[PDB]
Amino acid sequence: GGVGELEKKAEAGVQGELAEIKKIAEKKKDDVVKILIETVIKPSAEVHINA
Amino acid sequence: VEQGFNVKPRLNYNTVSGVNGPLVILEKVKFPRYNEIVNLTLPDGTVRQGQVLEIRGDRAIVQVFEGTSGIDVKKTTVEFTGESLRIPVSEDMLGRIFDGSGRPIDNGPKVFAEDYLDINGSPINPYARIYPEEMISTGVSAIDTMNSIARGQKIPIFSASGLPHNEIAAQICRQAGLVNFSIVFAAMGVNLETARFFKQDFEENGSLERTSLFLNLANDPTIERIITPRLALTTAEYLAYQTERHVLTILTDMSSYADALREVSAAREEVPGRRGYPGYMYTDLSTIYERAGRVEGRNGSITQIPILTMPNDDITHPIPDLTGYITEGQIFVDRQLHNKGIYPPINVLPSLSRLMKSAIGEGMTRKDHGDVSNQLYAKYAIGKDAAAMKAVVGEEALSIEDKLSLEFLEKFEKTFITQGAYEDRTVFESLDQAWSLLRIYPKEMLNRISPKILDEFY
Amino acid sequence: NREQVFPTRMTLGLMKTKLKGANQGYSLLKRKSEALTKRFRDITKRIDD
Amino acid sequence: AFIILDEVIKVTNRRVNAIEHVIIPRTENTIAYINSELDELDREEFYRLKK
Amino acid sequence: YGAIYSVSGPVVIAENMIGCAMYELVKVGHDNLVGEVIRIDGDKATIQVYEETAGLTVGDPVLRTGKPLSVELGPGLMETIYDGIQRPLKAIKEESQSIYIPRGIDTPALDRTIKWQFTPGKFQVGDHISGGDIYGSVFENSLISSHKILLPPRSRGTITWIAPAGEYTLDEKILEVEFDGKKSDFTLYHTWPVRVPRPVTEKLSADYPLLTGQRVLDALFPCVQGGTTCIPGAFGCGKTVISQSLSKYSNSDAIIYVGCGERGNEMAEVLMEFPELYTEMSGTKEPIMKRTTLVANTSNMPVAAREASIYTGITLAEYFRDQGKNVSMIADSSSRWAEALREISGRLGEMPADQGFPAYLGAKLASFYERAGKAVALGSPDRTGSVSIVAAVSPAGGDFSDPVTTATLGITQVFWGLDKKLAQRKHFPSINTSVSYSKYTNVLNKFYDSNYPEFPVLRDRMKEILSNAEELEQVVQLVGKSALSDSDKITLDVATLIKEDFLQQNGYSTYDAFCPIWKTFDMMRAFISYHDEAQKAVANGANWSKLADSTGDVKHAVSSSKFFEPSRGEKEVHGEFEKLLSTMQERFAE
């Protein structure tokens, strides 16, 4: 009983963290996706330093 | 960290000049970097990681992990990752079990990097180093009372081949604490049974919540065994200095690490040294150890328990000798004690903590710690001498201070040193047990204890 | 001035063990001699009396 | 008892002096010679490997 | 600038290095890693990078500095902390704001941002100037004022311009010297090859003693200013006490401390202890760090830095000697320096000679110790200076098995023999006078006949007393204590008094923190007078028990010789000893 109650309490604590993770991901997904795409599309066209 | 948002294409080399043992030799390499992590793609499709041991004109000697079996000159693609080995350090490393090369073998996701840190690190500025002050309490009563480990010192555990050094190290990992805290464990060349023992013990006893365990199996790559101390000490340096927590890094099987050093050194044309180990093993061990210590601006420490293994129980061996040289103490695990059945089989007489005076103080631990430790050592030596002399001059002819010393030796080996693997003896509880041992002596017999301490505690 | 033993890695360890045993025997025998000599002075005083 | 104890003390001190002046010095010299010969063999192996 | 060709461990081969010199420092890579050149083969030059060589590509530039491993000699050396390479630890920490030392950090070894007062010397425009000539002075500190600016020893020529008195930095020019053309221009500092000893006009014989302040080290086993000593240097023996004594109470006007591979926690101990030191001077109490340079060098440091730490320290000591100052160079862990040398030799591949050490360990140690000694400095004026080397022989203290220990004991003339057993027995400064020796008493006989005539005789008398005490202790261990004669009992009692009062010095205590040479001589004379009076009383036939009962007061009076504080000094304390010596005779006669 105690182990099951402890597991349920831990899931309750994890539920808040998981909800916050989902909310912040949904909030900043557009921003991080924009940065990643901007980095991928433009490459640094430069020769090696030692060359 | 804004420089992280960059894309660096990697050169895939199909040019393999030849294969010699563990090494893969390339050709037409554009600009190879020394100690560059490399992904070898076998013809069978298996991907293998490698590190370049040597560089030359458009030629790189890649030393692939997991051996060169199956490498084909014709169709082995070799991808150059233009960066030396790095670990994605984060505050979430605590609670993870990593492989020899940093890959998490735990049933969990990749560690979310907060930074990619170079595994080799940089030497700590001696001007920025601070003498250890307080004590890291260990559940091992013998260590925590007689060989107290200061916050920032490097005190190895010297054990033989079959002694329970791994069990003692696991106990230290499970029970260690401040008299935050985040232990870093590095298992090097351990048996697979030992590795699962470590993992299961930490997961079951909850010590994993503050440990970043680094498991390197005995059959894992030798270069990965070399890399593992670097990974563990880099994680410890992060945590302690960029997170302000006391670490207590616990390396294990520094003898296995030195064997890996030997194997890597002889991968090159380097001639063996004193007993096969390279001449720069002193430098390698010095780096691995002196990656610890307290620093000035940061409120965090790194402590080391290398848990070394003597090959033939010889202190004269190069690995124990050098480790002693760099380190600041020694804790001996004794075959005689182990055969008598005492756990932990720590032999106090040779063992000592060089920074005992710092850890055994008044604000830290208790005010009787140093005097009690000195008195216990003196009476233990007297007990050993009386045990030797009993079979020579009979039990009757021994003095009263020798019969009492034999009684103390029995009650010390069988009650104080003998500590259950899963019982936690705080430093104060172990001091109380030590006083209970010392109370069989008359108050006049305890010469090393100060009179004030005798009046207060006896 | 030394034993005519063929040098070997095992022989070095055996001779170090022999040196440790000889030191232990020397210390224990000196302790035995000291105790027996104390008893000896006691016995001489008893003999005179 | 005096005579027997005198004989035992004499033989014990003879053994103590014999050990400390013959057995310990001879064993220490043998240790030094064995270590020197092992160092010579290690040097020979090093030179062979260097060739 | 060359280019990298091959990297396999710390050894680096650099193609396109025509004009490179052997044992020349080069800047390896784009991070400007400093490394020396081991061997040259046409264009290619073999380089040992001092820092970590990881990440070095092919084609990375390899600049040629043009000089061997050099030492930054000039104002601003005194209070700083260095390494074997001589990189300022404090300035590196301030520049990088990190507890680590970044790879290829190029902070100048002398502070270029400090304005230094300069007063030109007697050399005027048009006057010939040669190597070592003091052409100016710099007020640097309180303990070390008038940092005498020296022309570089190799430099020579005729002065054309000299800097007028004022405040200058190290970067800006001070002197312009013409030699068949104005090819020379000099600043407040200069560089010297670290391996090359600084030349002197003449190396005199070291005659004046080095008063360490300790009674044992200043009486039984003295050292000469310019002499080389030896200390076991093992932990728990009092090497720290010896180091602090040499730092603050010695005659030396400057101190150079080198770690050359000691442990980190230890380096923390020394780097946190020396700034807390304070040496009382004529003016007021000022730190002993004002005259001591710490070459801090841990095991984590590059092996080349660890091998060059003692060489940098001795070059700094030679520089401060060239100014006419007496320097003491405390070399901690000479065995760890030898271990670094062995590691470098193994890396280079040279064959071992003894216990794995290189074939040139003995030659290197002999040259390093011969770099010490009193010597009149190069160039006018004719000032004289001395360098004394105090070398912690080995963590394997006094073990003849170690080739480095054997070489150090064979080359150095004074061995001060700390004893761990005496350290455990609460004996301070834990000197084992049975094994400790000094070979400088023969040359110090001249100074003693000049100043304190009876000193050699009384020192020999105490050595004889200690030897007789060892013999008497062996006799009393073998047989009954009462079996010893009256003379033997008197010798044992006098030696016990000597060990308890004269030899045992409480450095932490205020009264016996620093026993001057005159106080040590007076105490030695008093002890010898007491022993002679007891011997004469025994020869008269008086019972020794009754003599001791009657002369307990004299014994207490002579034991109080330690408690006489030398703060009064000179005749104030010397006059008190005359009464104590007189009381040791009248009471003994009665």
mmCIF file of C-alpha atoms in Angstrom, chain B residues 65-301:
data_model
loop_
_atom_site.group_PDB
_atom_site.id
_atom_site.type_symbol
_atom_site.label_atom_id
_atom_site.label_comp_id
_atom_site.label_asym_id
_atom_site.label_seq_id
_atom_site.Cartn_x
_atom_site.Cartn_y
_atom_site.Cartn_z
ATOM 1 C CA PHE B 65 37.645 1.320 -30.346
ATOM 2 C CA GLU B 66 36.327 -2.255 -30.187
ATOM 3 C CA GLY B 67 39.222 -3.446 -32.353
ATOM 4 C CA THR B 68 39.838 -3.519 -36.089
ATOM 5 C CA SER B 69 38.067 -6.816 -36.820
ATOM 6 C CA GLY B 70 36.267 -6.579 -40.153
ATOM 7 C CA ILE B 71 37.935 -3.358 -41.320
ATOM 8 C CA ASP B 72 38.320 -3.431 -45.109
ATOM 9 C CA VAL B 73 40.615 -1.094 -47.036
ATOM 10 C CA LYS B 74 38.272 -0.976 -50.025
ATOM 11 C CA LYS B 75 34.965 0.030 -48.433
ATOM 12 C CA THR B 76 35.447 1.250 -44.846
ATOM 13 C CA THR B 77 34.138 4.807 -44.672
ATOM 14 C CA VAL B 78 35.812 6.924 -41.985
ATOM 15 C CA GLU B 79 34.040 10.091 -40.825
ATOM 16 C CA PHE B 80 36.090 12.807 -39.125
ATOM 17 C CA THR B 81 34.297 14.654 -36.328
ATOM 18 C CA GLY B 82 36.344 17.833 -36.131
ATOM 19 C CA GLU B 83 36.438 17.922 -32.334
ATOM 20 C CA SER B 84 38.135 15.969 -29.569
ATOM 21 C CA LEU B 85 36.042 13.887 -27.195
ATOM 22 C CA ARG B 86 33.573 15.856 -25.080
ATOM 23 C CA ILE B 87 30.868 14.971 -22.555
ATOM 24 C CA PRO B 88 27.496 16.804 -22.557
ATOM 25 C CA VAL B 89 27.630 17.869 -18.919
ATOM 26 C CA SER B 90 24.430 18.892 -17.149
ATOM 27 C CA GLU B 91 22.971 19.038 -13.666
ATOM 28 C CA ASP B 92 20.937 15.979 -14.731
ATOM 29 C CA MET B 93 24.009 13.722 -14.849
ATOM 30 C CA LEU B 94 23.238 12.898 -11.218
ATOM 31 C CA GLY B 95 21.144 9.755 -11.456
ATOM 32 C CA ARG B 96 22.634 8.394 -14.685
ATOM 33 C CA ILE B 97 24.866 5.416 -15.447
ATOM 34 C CA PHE B 98 27.310 6.041 -18.290
ATOM 35 C CA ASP B 99 29.477 3.700 -20.339
ATOM 36 C CA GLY B 100 33.246 3.955 -20.662
ATOM 37 C CA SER B 101 32.936 6.519 -23.464
ATOM 38 C CA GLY B 102 30.082 8.518 -21.910
ATOM 39 C CA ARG B 103 27.132 6.868 -23.649
ATOM 40 C CA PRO B 104 24.347 6.375 -21.070
ATOM 41 C CA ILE B 105 23.832 2.647 -20.513
ATOM 42 C CA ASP B 106 20.941 3.420 -18.165
ATOM 43 C CA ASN B 107 17.395 2.954 -19.424
ATOM 44 C CA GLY B 108 17.142 6.693 -20.017
ATOM 45 C CA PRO B 109 17.531 9.362 -22.684
ATOM 46 C CA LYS B 110 20.715 11.128 -23.686
ATOM 47 C CA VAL B 111 21.813 13.708 -21.129
ATOM 48 C CA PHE B 112 20.514 17.142 -22.100
ATOM 49 C CA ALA B 113 23.715 19.074 -22.599
ATOM 50 C CA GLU B 114 24.135 22.368 -20.797
ATOM 51 C CA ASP B 115 27.676 22.392 -22.108
ATOM 52 C CA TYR B 116 30.072 20.222 -24.004
ATOM 53 C CA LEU B 117 33.204 19.998 -21.856
ATOM 54 C CA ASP B 118 36.612 18.761 -22.962
ATOM 55 C CA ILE B 119 37.368 15.528 -21.127
ATOM 56 C CA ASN B 120 41.049 16.363 -20.612
ATOM 57 C CA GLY B 121 40.353 19.675 -18.893
ATOM 58 C CA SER B 122 43.023 22.130 -17.829
ATOM 59 C CA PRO B 123 45.378 22.166 -14.833
ATOM 60 C CA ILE B 124 43.962 23.946 -11.803
ATOM 61 C CA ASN B 125 45.780 27.184 -11.021
ATOM 62 C CA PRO B 126 47.790 26.475 -7.835
ATOM 63 C CA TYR B 127 47.241 30.086 -6.795
ATOM 64 C CA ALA B 128 43.516 29.297 -7.064
ATOM 65 C CA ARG B 129 43.807 26.149 -4.920
ATOM 66 C CA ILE B 130 42.816 26.087 -1.247
ATOM 67 C CA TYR B 131 43.877 23.721 1.519
ATOM 68 C CA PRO B 132 41.165 21.215 2.528
ATOM 69 C CA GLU B 133 39.390 22.260 5.718
ATOM 70 C CA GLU B 134 36.450 20.058 6.736
ATOM 71 C CA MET B 135 35.694 16.328 6.547
ATOM 72 C CA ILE B 136 33.678 14.189 4.147
ATOM 73 C CA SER B 137 32.124 11.665 6.512
ATOM 74 C CA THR B 138 32.207 8.069 5.289
ATOM 75 C CA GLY B 139 29.963 5.322 6.614
ATOM 76 C CA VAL B 140 33.097 3.208 7.035
ATOM 77 C CA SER B 141 33.876 3.784 10.712
ATOM 78 C CA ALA B 142 37.522 2.798 10.261
ATOM 79 C CA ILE B 143 38.112 5.405 7.552
ATOM 80 C CA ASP B 144 35.942 8.138 9.065
ATOM 81 C CA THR B 145 37.581 7.803 12.499
ATOM 82 C CA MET B 146 41.211 6.822 11.910
ATOM 83 C CA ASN B 147 41.875 8.046 8.344
ATOM 84 C CA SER B 148 39.411 10.930 8.077
ATOM 85 C CA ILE B 149 39.126 12.248 4.529
ATOM 86 C CA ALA B 150 39.333 16.020 4.209
ATOM 87 C CA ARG B 151 37.225 17.936 1.693
ATOM 88 C CA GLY B 152 39.544 18.096 -1.308
ATOM 89 C CA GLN B 153 42.258 15.570 -0.469
ATOM 90 C CA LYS B 154 43.244 12.544 -2.565
ATOM 91 C CA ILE B 155 43.544 9.395 -0.450
ATOM 92 C CA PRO B 156 43.696 6.079 -2.342
ATOM 93 C CA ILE B 157 42.502 2.714 -1.096
ATOM 94 C CA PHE B 158 45.279 0.142 -1.523
ATOM 95 C CA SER B 159 43.845 -3.359 -1.928
ATOM 96 C CA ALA B 160 44.990 -6.683 -3.344
ATOM 97 C CA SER B 161 43.506 -8.721 -6.197
ATOM 98 C CA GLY B 162 40.720 -10.528 -4.360
ATOM 99 C CA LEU B 163 40.035 -8.193 -1.450
ATOM 100 C CA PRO B 164 36.606 -6.464 -1.329
ATOM 101 C CA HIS B 165 37.864 -3.108 -2.586
ATOM 102 C CA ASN B 166 34.861 -2.847 -4.909
ATOM 103 C CA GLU B 167 32.486 -3.590 -2.024
ATOM 104 C CA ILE B 168 34.209 -1.004 0.189
ATOM 105 C CA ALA B 169 34.030 1.562 -2.621
ATOM 106 C CA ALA B 170 30.330 0.831 -3.110
ATOM 107 C CA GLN B 171 29.798 1.274 0.632
ATOM 108 C CA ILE B 172 31.633 4.612 0.539
ATOM 109 C CA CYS B 173 29.481 5.676 -2.413
ATOM 110 C CA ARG B 174 26.296 4.633 -0.602
ATOM 111 C CA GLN B 175 27.099 6.178 2.784
ATOM 112 C CA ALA B 176 29.308 9.189 2.022
ATOM 113 C CA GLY B 177 28.114 12.614 3.090
ATOM 114 C CA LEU B 178 29.016 15.891 4.732
ATOM 115 C CA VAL B 179 29.601 15.747 8.483
ATOM 116 C CA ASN B 180 25.134 19.833 -1.597
ATOM 117 C CA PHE B 181 26.817 16.470 -2.163
ATOM 118 C CA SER B 182 27.168 14.570 -5.435
ATOM 119 C CA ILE B 183 29.365 11.473 -5.635
ATOM 120 C CA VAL B 184 30.959 10.610 -8.983
ATOM 121 C CA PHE B 185 31.759 6.925 -9.481
ATOM 122 C CA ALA B 186 34.111 5.557 -12.148
ATOM 123 C CA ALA B 187 34.442 1.790 -12.568
ATOM 124 C CA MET B 188 37.438 0.908 -14.750
ATOM 125 C CA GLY B 189 37.957 -2.571 -16.161
ATOM 126 C CA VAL B 190 35.615 -4.117 -13.601
ATOM 127 C CA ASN B 191 34.043 -7.514 -14.125
ATOM 128 C CA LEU B 192 30.512 -7.503 -15.492
ATOM 129 C CA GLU B 193 29.257 -9.024 -12.236
ATOM 130 C CA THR B 194 30.917 -6.155 -10.360
ATOM 131 C CA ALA B 195 29.344 -3.638 -12.744
ATOM 132 C CA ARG B 196 25.841 -4.991 -12.204
ATOM 133 C CA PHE B 197 26.569 -5.120 -8.471
ATOM 134 C CA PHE B 198 27.379 -1.400 -8.561
ATOM 135 C CA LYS B 199 24.326 -0.540 -10.661
ATOM 136 C CA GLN B 200 21.899 -2.628 -8.597
ATOM 137 C CA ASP B 201 23.293 -1.439 -5.259
ATOM 138 C CA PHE B 202 23.059 2.234 -6.217
ATOM 139 C CA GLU B 203 19.599 1.926 -7.782
ATOM 140 C CA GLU B 204 18.193 -0.083 -4.868
ATOM 141 C CA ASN B 205 19.745 1.935 -2.035
ATOM 142 C CA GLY B 206 18.953 5.285 -3.636
ATOM 143 C CA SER B 207 22.570 6.435 -3.800
ATOM 144 C CA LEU B 208 21.998 6.905 -7.540
ATOM 145 C CA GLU B 209 20.042 10.113 -6.902
ATOM 146 C CA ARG B 210 23.365 11.899 -6.296
ATOM 147 C CA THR B 211 25.826 9.801 -8.341
ATOM 148 C CA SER B 212 26.902 9.860 -11.981
ATOM 149 C CA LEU B 213 28.178 6.298 -12.272
ATOM 150 C CA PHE B 214 30.674 5.548 -15.060
ATOM 151 C CA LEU B 215 30.787 1.800 -15.738
ATOM 152 C CA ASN B 216 33.600 0.428 -17.906
ATOM 153 C CA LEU B 217 33.524 -3.350 -18.225
ATOM 154 C CA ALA B 218 36.635 -5.514 -18.330
ATOM 155 C CA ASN B 219 35.856 -6.462 -21.945
ATOM 156 C CA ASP B 220 35.078 -2.856 -22.885
ATOM 157 C CA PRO B 221 37.611 -1.068 -25.123
ATOM 158 C CA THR B 222 40.974 -0.236 -23.579
ATOM 159 C CA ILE B 223 40.838 3.298 -24.964
ATOM 160 C CA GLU B 224 37.424 3.661 -23.325
ATOM 161 C CA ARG B 225 39.013 2.514 -20.058
ATOM 162 C CA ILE B 226 41.577 5.286 -20.551
ATOM 163 C CA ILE B 227 38.853 7.835 -21.296
ATOM 164 C CA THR B 228 36.696 6.908 -18.288
ATOM 165 C CA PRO B 229 38.801 8.671 -15.582
ATOM 166 C CA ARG B 230 38.845 11.769 -17.779
ATOM 167 C CA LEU B 231 35.055 11.670 -18.087
ATOM 168 C CA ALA B 232 34.545 11.124 -14.360
ATOM 169 C CA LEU B 233 36.930 13.905 -13.358
ATOM 170 C CA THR B 234 35.451 16.293 -15.933
ATOM 171 C CA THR B 235 31.981 15.595 -14.539
ATOM 172 C CA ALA B 236 33.327 16.105 -11.015
ATOM 173 C CA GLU B 237 35.035 19.366 -11.985
ATOM 174 C CA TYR B 238 31.798 20.616 -13.462
ATOM 175 C CA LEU B 239 29.622 19.722 -10.646
ATOM 176 C CA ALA B 240 31.985 20.996 -7.954
ATOM 177 C CA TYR B 241 33.209 24.208 -9.561
ATOM 178 C CA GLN B 242 30.379 25.312 -11.872
ATOM 179 C CA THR B 243 27.653 23.989 -9.540
ATOM 180 C CA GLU B 244 29.143 24.528 -6.036
ATOM 181 C CA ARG B 245 28.709 21.051 -4.569
ATOM 182 C CA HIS B 246 31.189 18.693 -2.927
ATOM 183 C CA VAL B 247 31.821 15.676 -5.139
ATOM 184 C CA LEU B 248 34.043 12.900 -3.708
ATOM 185 C CA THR B 249 34.989 11.263 -6.983
ATOM 186 C CA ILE B 250 35.520 7.528 -6.424
ATOM 187 C CA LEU B 251 37.693 5.953 -9.098
ATOM 188 C CA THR B 252 38.146 2.182 -8.978
ATOM 189 C CA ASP B 253 40.834 -0.164 -10.321
ATOM 190 C CA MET B 254 43.554 2.347 -11.068
ATOM 191 C CA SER B 255 45.621 -0.781 -11.713
ATOM 192 C CA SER B 256 43.226 -1.586 -14.560
ATOM 193 C CA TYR B 257 43.551 2.021 -15.716
ATOM 194 C CA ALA B 258 47.346 1.677 -15.723
ATOM 195 C CA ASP B 259 47.073 -1.564 -17.702
ATOM 196 C CA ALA B 260 44.973 0.364 -20.219
ATOM 197 C CA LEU B 261 47.693 3.039 -20.248
ATOM 198 C CA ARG B 262 50.238 0.319 -21.008
ATOM 199 C CA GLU B 263 48.117 -1.035 -23.863
ATOM 200 C CA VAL B 264 47.596 2.421 -25.385
ATOM 201 C CA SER B 265 51.270 3.366 -25.007
ATOM 202 C CA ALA B 266 52.412 0.183 -26.741
ATOM 203 C CA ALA B 267 49.913 0.864 -29.532
ATOM 204 C CA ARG B 268 52.471 3.469 -30.555
ATOM 205 C CA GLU B 269 56.143 2.537 -30.906
ATOM 206 C CA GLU B 270 56.786 3.612 -27.302
ATOM 207 C CA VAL B 271 59.254 1.402 -25.417
ATOM 208 C CA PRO B 272 57.933 0.096 -22.066
ATOM 209 C CA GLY B 273 59.243 1.556 -18.835
ATOM 210 C CA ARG B 274 59.986 0.131 -15.395
ATOM 211 C CA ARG B 275 57.534 -2.799 -15.470
ATOM 212 C CA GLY B 276 55.921 -2.235 -18.862
ATOM 213 C CA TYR B 277 54.109 0.925 -17.815
ATOM 214 C CA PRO B 278 55.210 4.037 -19.730
ATOM 215 C CA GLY B 279 57.643 6.553 -18.308
ATOM 216 C CA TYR B 280 54.900 9.202 -18.321
ATOM 217 C CA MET B 281 52.545 7.168 -16.130
ATOM 218 C CA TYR B 282 53.544 9.554 -13.346
ATOM 219 C CA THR B 283 52.262 12.443 -15.466
ATOM 220 C CA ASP B 284 49.040 10.637 -16.409
ATOM 221 C CA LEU B 285 48.256 9.667 -12.814
ATOM 222 C CA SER B 286 49.200 13.178 -11.690
ATOM 223 C CA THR B 287 46.667 14.693 -14.081
ATOM 224 C CA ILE B 288 43.952 12.195 -13.119
ATOM 225 C CA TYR B 289 44.472 12.812 -9.397
ATOM 226 C CA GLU B 290 45.258 16.545 -9.258
ATOM 227 C CA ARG B 291 42.086 17.171 -11.222
ATOM 228 C CA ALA B 292 40.652 17.217 -7.668
ATOM 229 C CA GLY B 293 41.070 19.632 -4.766
ATOM 230 C CA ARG B 294 39.416 22.685 -3.266
ATOM 231 C CA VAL B 295 39.544 26.035 -5.059
ATOM 232 C CA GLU B 296 39.249 29.632 -3.906
ATOM 233 C CA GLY B 297 36.358 31.392 -5.627
ATOM 234 C CA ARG B 298 34.055 28.365 -5.773
ATOM 235 C CA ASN B 299 32.230 26.848 -2.798
ATOM 236 C CA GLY B 300 32.810 23.283 -3.964
ATOM 237 C CA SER B 301 35.359 20.524 -3.550
#
